[PDB]
Amino acid sequence: EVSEFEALRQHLMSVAYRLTGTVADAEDIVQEAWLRWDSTVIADPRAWLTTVVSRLGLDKLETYTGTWLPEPVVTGLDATDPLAAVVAAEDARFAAMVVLERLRPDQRVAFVLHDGFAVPFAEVAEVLGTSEAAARQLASRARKAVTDPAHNEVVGRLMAAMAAGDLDTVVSLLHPDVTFTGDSNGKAPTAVRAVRGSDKVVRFILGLVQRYGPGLFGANQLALVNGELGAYTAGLPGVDGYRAMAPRITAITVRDGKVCALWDIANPDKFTGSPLK
């Protein structure tokens, strides 16, 4: 009873959160799935509730600032959490999700349902509303809009290293076009606009340890961010004339064995995938 049930709702949550970029937006869309279950004698609850959720997800597809970013899901290292199964998929990675958010409120459902969730186009066409090839084409314009197993090794190395101020190591681990992007909807000093490039990202970073100090690392917890090892912070008070910092969640993106991007998420309104909340 509960098993088959939880597996479906997980599937429903898995698709819902990805349809948007918010776990509250998924929490409210799966909310109707149950209510719209009504009819059966013979039925396929799995295929039906997707459409219901997918359409409600399309119904979705304060706010006086800029540079939007997706709400993250933060589970413990056991990944036993109920929101873990949501982001267990590798394409639920924060990098993958920011690609999807603030970019495609149209090519989303076609790409997500098919690339991510392996839904054939005829069924995607159903929630869509048109032809077979018209689902593949609204999906093909998504796969174009896009243009490592060392993650823990690279995040791990980094998590400690930077506390030595080993700057020679840190600039090599970064991409020449590495990025630091902060969700500035939240009232918190961040990259209110995106900062670009290696040496220049380091500069921004140097300001951080300068501003908040070294207690910085002690409030920063090791945790799973969207299925892979990232980190979040409970915040700091600042007692040696350092600025009081805010609790926030920081995701990391890795390729070439180098940190290709960093993500700053500081809006308290987006903590519903978090231990903070």
Swiss-Prot record:
Keywords: DNA-binding, Sigma factor, Stress response, Transcription, Transcription regulation
Region (Sigma-70 factor domain-4) location: 97-145
A GO biological process held by the record: DNA-templated transcription initiation
Chain span(s) of sequence motif Polymerase core binding: 28-31
Entry superkingdom: Bacteria
Inducers of expression: Undetectable expression in log phase, 18-fold induced by 30 days, decreasing slightly after (at protein level). Up-regulated 2.4-fold 7 days after infection of human macrophages.
GO terms for MF: DNA binding; sigma factor activity
Region (Sigma-70 factor domain-2): 5-61
Description of the deletion phenotype: No difference in growth in culture up to 120 days. Increased sensitivity to 10 and 20 mM H(2)O(2), no difference in response to growth at 53 degrees Celsius, pH 4.0, 10% ethanol or 0.05% sodium dodecyl sulfate (surface stress). No detectable difference in spleen or lungs of infected BALB/c mice during 15 weeks growth.
SUPFAM superfamilies: NTF2-like, Sigma2 domain of RNA polymerase sigma factors, Sigma3 and sigma4 domains of RNA polymerase sigma factors
Chain residues forming the annotated DNA-binding region: 121-140
Notes on the domains: The sigma-70 factor domain-2 mediates sequence-specific interaction with the -10 element in promoter DNA, and plays an important role in melting the double-stranded DNA and the formation of the transcription bubble. The sigma-70 factor domain-2 mediates interaction with the RNA polymerase subunits RpoB and RpoC. The sigma-70 factor domain-4 contains a helix-turn-helix (H-T-H) motif that mediates interaction with the -35 element in promoter DNA. The domain also mediates interaction with the RNA polymerase subunit RpoA. Interactions between sigma-70 factor domain-4 and anti-sigma factors prevents interaction of sigma factors with the RNA polymerase catalytic core.
Record's subunit section: Interacts transiently with the RNA polymerase catalytic core formed by RpoA, RpoB, RpoC and RpoZ (2 alpha, 1 beta, 1 beta' and 1 omega subunit) to form the RNA polymerase holoenzyme that can initiate transcription.
Family: Belongs to the sigma-70 factor family. ECF subfamily.
Function field: Sigma factors are initiation factors that promote the attachment of RNA polymerase to specific initiation sites and are then released. Extracytoplasmic function (ECF) sigma factors are held in an inactive form by an anti-sigma factor until released, although no anti-sigma factor is known for this protein. Regulates the promoter of SigI, may not be autoregulated.
Name recorded for this polypeptide: ECF RNA polymerase sigma factor SigJ
Gene responsible for this protein: sigJ
